[PDB]
Amino acid sequence: STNIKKHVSQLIGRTPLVYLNKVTEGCGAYVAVKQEMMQPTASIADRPAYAMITDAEEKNLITPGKTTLIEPTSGNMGISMAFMAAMKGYKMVLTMPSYTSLERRVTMRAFGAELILTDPAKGMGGTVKKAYELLENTPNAHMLQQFSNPANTQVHFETTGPEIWEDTNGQVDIFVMGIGSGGTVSGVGQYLKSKNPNVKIYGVEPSESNVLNGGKPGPHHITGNGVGFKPDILDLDVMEKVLEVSSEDAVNMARVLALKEGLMVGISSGANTVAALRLAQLPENKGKLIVTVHPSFGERYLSSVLFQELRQEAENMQPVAV
Amino acid sequence: STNIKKHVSQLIGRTPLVYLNKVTEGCGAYVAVKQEMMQPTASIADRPAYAMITDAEEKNLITPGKTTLIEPTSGNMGISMAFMAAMKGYKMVLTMPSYTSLERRVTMRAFGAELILTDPAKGMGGTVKKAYELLENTPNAHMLQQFSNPANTQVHFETTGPEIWEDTNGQVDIFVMGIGSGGTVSGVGQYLKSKNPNVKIYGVEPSESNVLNGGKPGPHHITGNGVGFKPDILDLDVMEKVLEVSSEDAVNMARVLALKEGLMVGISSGANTVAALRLAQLPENKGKLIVTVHPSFGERYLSSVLFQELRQEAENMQPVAV
Numbered sequence: 001s002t003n004i005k006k007h008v009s010q011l012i013g014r015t016p017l018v019y020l021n022k023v024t025e026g027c028g029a030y031v032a033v034k035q036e037m038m039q040p041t042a043s044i045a046d047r048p049a050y051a052m053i054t055d056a057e058e059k060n061l062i063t064p065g066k067t068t069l070i071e072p073t074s075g076n077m078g079i080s081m082a083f084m085a086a087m088k089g090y091k092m093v094l095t096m097p098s099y100t101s102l103e104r105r106v107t108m109r110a111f112g113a114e115l116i117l118t119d120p121a122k123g124m125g126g127t128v129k130k131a132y133e134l135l136e137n138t139p140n141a142h143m144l145q146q147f148s149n150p151a152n153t154q155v156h157f158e159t160t161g162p163e164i165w166e167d168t169n170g171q172v173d174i175f176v177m178g179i180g181s182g183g184t185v186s187g188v189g190q191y192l193k194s195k196n197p198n199v200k201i202y203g204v205e206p207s208e209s210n211v212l213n214g215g216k217p218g219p220h221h222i223t224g225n226g227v228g229f230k231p232d233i234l235d236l237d238v239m240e241k242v243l244e245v246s247s248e249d250a251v252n253m254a255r256v257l258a259l260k261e262g263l264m265v266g267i268s269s270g271a272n273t274v275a276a277l278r279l280a281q282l283p284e285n286k287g288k289l290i291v292t293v294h295p296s297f298g299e300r301y302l303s304s305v306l307f308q309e310l311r312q313e314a315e316n317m318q319p320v321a322v
Numbered sequence: 323s324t325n326i327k328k329h330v331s332q333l334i335g336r337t338p339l340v341y342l343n344k345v346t347e348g349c350g351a352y353v354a355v356k357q358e359m360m361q362p363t364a365s366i367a368d369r370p371a372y373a374m375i376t377d378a379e380e381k382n383l384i385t386p387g388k389t390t391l392i393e394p395t396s397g398n399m400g401i402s403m404a405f406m407a408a409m410k411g412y413k414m415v416l417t418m419p420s421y422t423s424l425e426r427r428v429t430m431r432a433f434g435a436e437l438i439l440t441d442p443a444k445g446m447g448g449t450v451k452k453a454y455e456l457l458e459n460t461p462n463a464h465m466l467q468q469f470s471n472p473a474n475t476q477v478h479f480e481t482t483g484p485e486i487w488e489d490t491n492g493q494v495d496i497f498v499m500g501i502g503s504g505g506t507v508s509g510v511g512q513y514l515k516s517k518n519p520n521v522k523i524y525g526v527e528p529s530e531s532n533v534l535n536g537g538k539p540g541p542h543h544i545t546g547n548g549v550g551f552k553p554d555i556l557d558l559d560v561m562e563k564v565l566e567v568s569s570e571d572a573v574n575m576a577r578v579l580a581l582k583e584g585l586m587v588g589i590s591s592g593a594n595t596v597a598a599l600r601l602a603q604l605p606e607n608k609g610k611l612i613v614t615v616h617p618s619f620g621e622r623y624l625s626s627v628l629f630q631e632l633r634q635e636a637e638n639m640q641p642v643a644v
């Protein structure tokens with residue numbers, strides 16, 4: 001009868017693409033970026049959170065008011081799970097390393113989830129290990145396990161990829177995306193290549209923790225990428241290669257995106273944009289359409305290295321007389 | 323050739339409506355809410371910011387790189403103007419009372435705008451006075467003046483109103499909206515009544531500063547409403563009446579919206595929702611479609627009274643061993 005959504009979860013998906021022409025000056029390729037800040041919790045993680053929880057219900061694995069859901073996260077998946085659990089009536093417990101932004105912690109709690117922070121030194125690997133310990137010691141609990149759950153990849157094959165194909169009217173030549181769980185790059189990549197096998201798919205990881213390129217895990221600032229291990233769901237074969245972007249470059253670019261393009265986005269958005277620009281410099285990519293993603297909104301990073309200096313300045317601002 | 327937007331400003335507008343069925347339990351009316359978090363800077367102010375600056379350019383009043391734009395704000399307009407200014411190449415100066423959330427300050431600065439906080443005891447009135455002082459003392463400066471600029475009302479007549487009419491397939495019976503500048507309630511109200519004169523339009527103001535109902539200005543927590551004076555653009559005649567909601571009720575409702583409805587929204591969103599439910603309680607409104615707005619995303623309020631306590635708790639969390 002109307003266009004009014006029946007459920008808040010129906011607000012997930014179908015995000016816009018927009019061209020960049022400022023940070024791309026002189027690069028010689030088209031660059032379009034998908035804006036995942038237009039999701040109900042303002043990151044791309046709403047997609048796999050919805051898909052995994054719904055899949056578990058269809059499989060008759062979990063039950064509202066009975067099952068405790070437990071999930072490891074660098075923040076966004078945690079928020080998105082907290083959001084789904086709030087709506088569907090599940091107790092939600094997240095594990096997250098203590099080095100991720102304060103805003104991530106507060107938002108999870110605002111949706112009523114319980115949060116356990118883990119040793120910072122042990123990174124996402126430690127947060128996953130803690131989640132398994134909690135699972136083993138909690139009656140009637142279930143872990144969706146984003147790093148191993150194929151519904152994660154599938155949602156991107158089903159929705160994020162088709163959205164890119166349709167919005168570019170089949171013209172996308174290159175897709176680049178940083179890897180956290182690997183769900184996005186794997187699902188979008190598999191889909192785009194099923195429509196045009198010439199499409200080139202690139203992952204991105206932090207130079208500091210370049211494990212996919214054979215390096216050692218280490219601390220870095222690109223929250224949402226570089227978990228320090230190869231996720232089970234990551235499809236290595238679909239990617240041409242995994243590009244490396246330094247934490248410093250990713251952070252610097254995210255700041256420029258706000259100041260020059262009007263896009264207040266997260267650190268992984270900056271990393272993706274650096275990677276896309278690097279691809280544009282290559283002779284073989286001149287005149288091609290490169291699509292990447294800005295996976296999260298910048299206000300979730302006020303306390304991170306991205307904006308903490310500004311935040312401190314802002315906290316010390318004082319009123320003037322009128 | 324594609325659906326890719328040419329400019330980031332084209333990401334503004336066309337936001338969804340969603341039904342509420344949890345906070346509305348037992349109320350006997352339909353309640354749908356418009357989600358302005360789906361804007362590029364995550365609040366309703368992107369609409370009037372774009373409309374006012376664009377209108378000024380069309381009238382040949384301002385020039386990028388020459389004109390300094392000055393605007394008084396409670397935060398969201400400031401952010402939206404900083405955003406438009408960053409993209410279009412204007413120097414931007416905002417005045418805002420020092421009592422509004424820290425997040426508002428940081429986001430404005432992230433877009434490169436200059437921010438002057440004003441004495442908190444003087445509220446939005448003082449912030450407007452300061453903006454006029456800066457205007458008088460700054461060469462080649464211009465103030466859009468959201469409280470007096472008809473382009474503010476007009477953008478809602480043109481876009482927010484029509485979106486509501488179309489999305490409800492003409493079925494909306496009642497629209498309710500808190501008043502900051504009064505642009506939204508005025509423009510939406512004017513449009514809806516133009517389509518169906520029987521549609522009833524209600525404003526909201528804080529119980530603490532109920533100046534539209536003849537009370538005195540006072541401090542309150544409903545940021546974005548209750549500026550403490552009647553804005554020039556506010557169309558009193560289009561409203562049945564201006565409802566009063568307490569700061570306490572608005573804040574409590576915003577918290578419940580997150581926990582129960584999965585909607586992480588700001589304090590004025592809570593206030594609108596309280597008002598919507600109060601209207602639903604009247605026998606005359608049973609079975610009617612009531613539409614309201616959630617004008618801003620909740621992460622901009624982490625340091626405000628809305629989530630301050632949770633934020634302090636979050637800051638105090640410590641990592642556990644793995």
Ligand SMILES: Cc1ncc(COP(=O)(O)O)c(CN[C@@H](CS)C(=O)O)c1O
Nearest residue numbers: 073074076077180181182184224268295
């Ligand atoms: C800001 C940000 N940017 C990129 C990604 C990557 O998307 P993937 O499809 O998971 O590879 C993520 C996903 N972060 C997951 C896993 S680390 C989380 O727990 O929040 C992210 O949060």
Ligand SMILES: Cc1ncc(COP(=O)(O)O)c(CN[C@@H](CS)C(=O)O)c1O
Nearest residue numbers: 395396398399502503504505506546590
């Ligand atoms: C969170 C929030 N909620 C409601 C409104 C009101 O919309 P109006 O069309 O202005 O009446 C506003 C508008 N706040 C303007 C004027 S106070 C600002 O300077 O930010 C808002 O920020």
